[PDB]
Design a protein around this ligand. Structure first.
Ligand SMILES: *Cc1cc2c(cc1C)nc1c(=O)[nH]c(=O)nc-1n2C[C@H](O)[C@H](O)[C@H](O)COP(=O)(O)OP(=O)(O)OC[C@H]1O[C@@H](n2cnc3c(N)ncnc32)[C@H](O)[C@@H]1O
Ligand SMILES: *Cc1cc2c(cc1C)nc1c(=O)[nH]c(=O)nc-1n2C[C@H](O)[C@H](O)[C@H](O)COP(=O)(O)OP(=O)(O)OC[C@H]1O[C@@H](n2cnc3c(N)ncnc32)[C@H](O)[C@@H]1O
Ligand SMILES: *Cc1cc2c(cc1C)nc1c(=O)[nH]c(=O)nc-1n2C[C@H](O)[C@H](O)[C@H](O)COP(=O)(O)OP(=O)(O)OC[C@H]1O[C@@H](n2cnc3c(N)ncnc32)[C@H](O)[C@@H]1O
Lengths: 553, 555, 555
């Protein structure tokens, strides 16, 4: 509780010590860790909460003065009123496995990272008839999966998981994360949420604003402990202004609870793989997809994975090639052959009773048969190490950590995400792939990515892997991402999600009518948090105390 | 114009004229009607909606009243009018079409406001994109309009609509209200992406991927913001980057909406409407229970509906065609009406979509499922008389605008509807309790219960169709009592209301008072941030800006 | 007057009339024209400049539009008008003569502003001092005016002017814009000392040694500030003591300039104009390289110029006199035009000044220097046909106003110019790259490249002469695209623009965004300090005072 590496802006060593003393008294020093020593990157099992584990900037560039971990909601309210008093900026995390996007690191160096999930980790409710659950920030996907297994529940309810099962359900959902079942759109499938505002008051959204009737057993409970109205997590909208969205990808409050819809057991499942021989086959693949996914033949969020993405799960670059320079079109085709895979590979799944799956499979099979050399497999038709057998788990909400392995492609693996949005049009996908690829090869990187598919849009997750001891390769990775953002905005593709180092540049792409969108958000931001306390800079939304000349990247 | 019926608060007749002078000089005289006489406050009809007051008046006819009507030509005029309203601190009340009958019509909350008719002159279908399966509309594009525009382009073989019970509504307007359709695309609000707004400060704003600008190119140069094209992804993906602000402008007074992107369902390549009659009054409980898993599993694809017998019977006749009885029809009489029309006491309407192998399976499932109920009969449109409700809902559940549902408003003489719209769990017990509360209060007030459960995913909108004689000033007072009581009864049992009439907005938002009205105090902070002068629709959804006395204006 | 075409922001028609009433009562009716009809927005000519809108309109003709024209008699009226504009918060847009065609003409940035015609009635040459070699002028003193005044006093044997390409411009006006002449005294702004200004607060101010007051004496008593004489050193030495503030009032909206002191070159005692033809398109690279050291060494005394063949050819004829071709002339055709007129593809115009022993040496140097190029031919005015451009520039490079250059605006039917004016290093490679960017975009838009490098000391102003048919609404949109693209291309290669049209002011200042628009945020702080009410020319050079929404008004 004395001397930290960095402090937040305009702030005296007296004040920090005075602040963190009061905190160390509120939550006990078990739950306080001041950052005093010259900050290790940590693992997925025990993630760092100090700085960016997959640093593309300098390692120390995003740096927490401390880490606080409240026991409950009250302590959050207390910490905030203290933050307000000292004009001490916060940075909420749920779990802090948001690697690829900066992890648990704050934008403003000197901030407290508020580890919400360390203690607040209860699966508050799983509800079978409403087909929902209510979770705190500390509930991971494996955790929630576990809860279902210990109560014999996957007979009745399945999850939706991102590629790894370690993320926060709460946390992923407010970043508008994505999965790969029919409930892949995580933000969409929320209903009812609790929030500590910058002023310390508790606000519950949607039908959660309708209080549960007064009665003997719940009488005298604190707000944070009060139960929800019956409809709270069944109907997202409530009455009047639908505000829920003000707390997604924002710095408008601290989220303490949330309802998530769970898809009930289909009563029949079957994943599949479709390999696409040629690199050119993508255009035609996306054109066939468009009306299949619009039609609800492709019921889940399906995904077109580049060859190197599959290859990188199975081994590192070394295990394929000894070369420094990026792999050629010829060498990729060999790997395709070495694995019994296409230059692109379409993973997907069927849901519901046998006769329905029969009709959609028939059509998907003949639909795709339009492409020369196409082939079809189920899990059983593939090698026991094959990716399909992993994604077979993913696409029914069984968590896996197998997908982590492609980070190791290069030694000292870090990922960085460039994630623009395209039309579900072969022409658009290809013109975007070609922009991405051009810049990757200029930057000396192997192109790795997916095109994942929503209803009418395609998230093109580009998977930038780099050696983080290699200071040259970072410098040009930084160039790659800054160039690709400016490029894709020059063909009308925006990014839906990013890393801390780019939130300013990306928000500047969204500058229709002289940055009208951002100007409106600032007004909202400064309205609800006068003292600029909560996560300044998040999504490039700066409160009025942060001058845009010192602080915009 | 010189001498209006009411003025808005804190404002002199000299100022109204200076204000309307400067406005007739912007929009033109054609586009301004000033309500200067009791000739102008006439209820009119659905085909010609009054734009001055509540046509379906539960309060005094003239309680909610406009000083004047102003039909902006285009978005610039709105920017201009907002700027002027700010200068004169003149409250505005935006509408798109103004058929929000049952929830106040076109009337403003604050008497003396300008009803800003957004759809008189902003009524173009700006875009229909087939490969994206979406359209872009300005405020005045009705359902029948958008529908016609599809027929005029031989597009229905590719794209279908989603319609509410009546085809005259604004696509734009209903969406922001979160109205309810009856195909898969029924949640009209969900099915939006990218929308344009004039703020209280006059600035133009586009949400989602609208904020990403369509790249410069020669043919788009020198265009006024409102007339610029959109990005590739504006209407393909609603979130964009950063805070998702779209919800701030649904059921709110934070902006004036100029354009919206709406998704359209593609033509399913096969369709089959159907009706399942549920014999006894009590068959509702078992029915909901059967409906729950099939909706959750997506065996029920559309937004199906469970229609109380009087709803269907009111479509086919007014009350005096059935009883010539003053009091509300007995249980014993409700059955004879049902036997007379070959209907159940509850009636379940629904549609199957897709290729016929798939539809057949889903029908096998639904039919076997419902067969658990004693007496159940199934029908396709084909199997019922021409006048039947199913042939209307056959059209409704594949996006075709109709107007047949109007008839039920004439249940009583001088008939007007009012909707009390509480939400419920998809649970027989919960559905039945709510119904029991509702029905008991309807008897207590001397009204025939009429209503419908529209089944969302995890959730039912129980629409309660209050039909009253609007010349009967004793019935109004009972209706008001009925509404104010039911809000409290249903709040006392944990059911919220998703949508209301102007007169009940403040009471309804008073039920959302978890943690000492925390949700309202937050919306108030936001409102005052973005509309310092309280120009836009003060009192919409209980949200009063700081100039309005909560003591004086709440109800 | 009662009903103008546009009004300024946030302002009622009642206020405009109260404001113009009080003004007709100050200046007089003769000095106020109110733009109340579409008869008044006529482009007119160079000899009679419209003072209401952009005569050379790339936007809609009426995008930039005045509410009214006001011709103050004298400095008091300005103090009065400023005071009143402040009271009514009425934006003003000062002009001296209003021939800023190619950069917006006399139009204001904010539609509805008062164009304040400073040179109608303040047009005296206040002083010509021979021993100091300087003059003092009010706003309305054109070049031809000042020139005539020298002939009327048999002064040319002692003092010469410096003129831009056209003699109708304001000496005052061009200087504050930093226009460019073509003798040694070409940097018109450099060549100023001591200037008088009315501030936004009404107070009168004199810069440099103007702030040192001319000592009291009997014949100067009781004079109104504006009519007081100046100090000995006011116009001999520009700095004075303390902060040098003169730059705050060039290309800015910080003041209204009432008087300026300008230095005049003495008669050199010998002069010789000349033209050097550079045969091939590519001879530009070698040429610049030769020009660099000779300019730096002062072997090239004046501001010489490198004129693209079409510039000279456009002076001699419109496009239909050469091709009757829609598309832009090919490289192969540009050569035949050059052979037809005994000219190079580039053409270098220049002058030698001083006593003949000195001129001869400098010509020996220049001639030998340029001889490095294959094909080079030299000429004196004498050696060319009467119609030639050199006889015009012979007059231009010794201060004589002409109007022959006007012809090139008629290259196309309904022709209007627009200047894109990026800066470059005096380096062949850099000159050539910039030219390659510019030319490529001109082809991409379907325009003939026409342009000129005017060589400063270390620096070249590459003036790009965009001629377009102003009735062709497809070409305007291409021109706009051309301009907005080129700003970005040239910013992407480190070239800034020194001067622009109203429509491109905000984009251009957006390139000056080093350190998160630090230079603009500073100028904004200053602006708001000195003009709290945002009265003076809001939006000049991208500088918006705090009342204007940057969201709404930027382009
Ligand atoms: C490395 C990697 C990452 C990854 C992935 C595959 C690999 C190999 N696949 C992903 C996928 O398929 N889908 C997806 O959405 N993300 C994927 N990622 C990224 C990441 O693993 C996941 O998104 C992960 O679930 C996110 O991490 P976590 O859940 O730990 O999130 P967080 O750091 O706690 O939160 C991120 C930010 O959100 C704001 N935040 C979080 N909690 C709160 C609360 N309670 N209140 C207010 N704001 C909150 C903060 O801005 C925080 O930094
Ligand atoms: C009488 C009746 C009504 C009815 C119905 C059946 C009958 C017999 N069935 C309905 C149904 O199945 N589903 C449904 O959603 N509504 C149903 N109704 C009610 C009504 O007919 C419809 O909701 C109708 O579409 C709404 O009317 P309209 O489309 O005319 O909308 P509005 O009255 O113009 O707008 C209502 C409110 O919306 C806000 N608003 C509208 N436009 C704007 C803009 N541009 N900017 C800002 N706000 C806007 C205002 O709050 C306005 O008061
Ligand atoms: C069409 C054309 C234009 C042209 C040219 C050749 C042709 C064919 N060659 C030029 C050249 O060689 N050098 C040059 O500098 N300019 C050339 N031009 C452009 C134009 O003709 C001249 O620049 C001309 O002298 C400018 O017109 P004018 O002298 O009329 O100036 P203005 O329009 O009245 O003023 C322009 C702006 O200046 C500010 N201003 C002017 N007076 C005041 C006062 N008193 N106070 C405050 N500000 C003032 C305003 O910003 C005004 O908008």
């Amino acid at each position: 509780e004395f001397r930290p590496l960095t402090l937040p802006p305009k702030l005296s060593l007296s004040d920090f010590n005075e602040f963190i003393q009061d905190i160390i008294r509120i939550v006990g020093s078990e739950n306080v860790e001041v950052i005093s020593s010259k900050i290790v990157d940590g693992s997925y099992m025990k993630p760092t909460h100090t700085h960016d584990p997959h640093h593309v900037m300098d390692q120390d560039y995003f740096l927490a003065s401390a880490i606080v971990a409240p026991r409950n909601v009250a302590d959050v309210q207390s910490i905030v009123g203290l933050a307000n008093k000292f004009s001490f900026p916060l940075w909420p995390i749920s779990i802090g496995r948001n690697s690829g996007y900066g992890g648990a690191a704050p934008r403003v160096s000197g901030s407290v990272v508020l580890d919400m999930g360390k203690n607040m980790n209860r699966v508050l409710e799983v509800n079978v008839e409403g087909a929902y659950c209510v979770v705190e920030p500390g509930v991971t996907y494996h955790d929630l999966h576990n809860y279902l297994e210990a109560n014999n529940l996957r007979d009745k309810l399945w999850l939706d998981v991102p590629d790894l099962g370690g993320g926060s359900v709460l946390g992923n959902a407010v970043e508008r994360g994505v999965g790969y079942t029919p409930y892949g759109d995580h933000w969409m499938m929320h209903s009812g949420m609790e929030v500590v505002l910058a002023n310390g008051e508790l606000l519950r959204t949607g039908m959660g604003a309708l209080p549960d009737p007064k009665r003997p057993e719940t009488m005298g409970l604190k707000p944070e402990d009060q139960p929800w109205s019956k409809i709270a997590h069944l109907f997202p909208y409530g009455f009047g202004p639908y505000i829920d969205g003000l707390f997604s990808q924002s710095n408008m409050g601290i989220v303490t609870k949330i309802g998530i819809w769970l898809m009930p057991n289909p009563r029949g499942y079957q994943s599949y793989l479709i390999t696409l021989p040629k690199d050119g086959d993508l255009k035609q693949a996306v054109d066939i997809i468009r009306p299949l996914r619009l039609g609800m033949a492709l019921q889940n969020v399906p995904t077109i994975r580049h060859i190197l993405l599959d290859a990188a799960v199975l081994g590192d670059k070394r295990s394929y090639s000894s070369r420094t320079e990026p792999l050629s079109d010829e060498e990729l085709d060999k790997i395709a052959k070495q694995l019994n895979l296409g230059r692109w590979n379409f993973y997907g799944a069927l849901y519901g009773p046998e006769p329905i799956r029969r009709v959609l499979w028939e059509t998907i099979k003949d639909a795709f048969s339009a492409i020369p050399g196409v082939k079809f497999y189920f899990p059983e038709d593939t090698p026991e190490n094959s990716v399909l057998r992993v994604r077979d788990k993913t696409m029914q909400g069984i968590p896996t950590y197998d997908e982590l392995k492609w980070i190791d492609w290069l030694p000292n693996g870090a990922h960085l995400f460039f994630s623009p949005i395209a039309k579900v049009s072969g022409e658009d996908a290809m013109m975007q792939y070609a922009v991405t690829k051009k810049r990757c090869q200029e930057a000396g990187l192997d192109f790795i990515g997916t095109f994942t598919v929503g209803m009418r849009e395609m998230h093109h997750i580009v998977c930038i892997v780099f050696n983080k001891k290699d200071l040259i390769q970072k410098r040009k990775v930084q160039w790659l991402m800054r160039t690709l953002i400016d490029d894709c905005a020059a063909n009308g593709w925006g990014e839906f999600r990013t890393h801390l180092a780019f939130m300013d540049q990306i928000m500047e792409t969204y500058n229709w009518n002289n940055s009208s969108f951002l100007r409106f958000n600032e007004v909202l931001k400064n309205a609800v948090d006068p003292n600029g306390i909560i996560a300044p800079g998040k999504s490039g939304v700066w409160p009025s105390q942060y001058s845009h000349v010192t602080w915009k990247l």
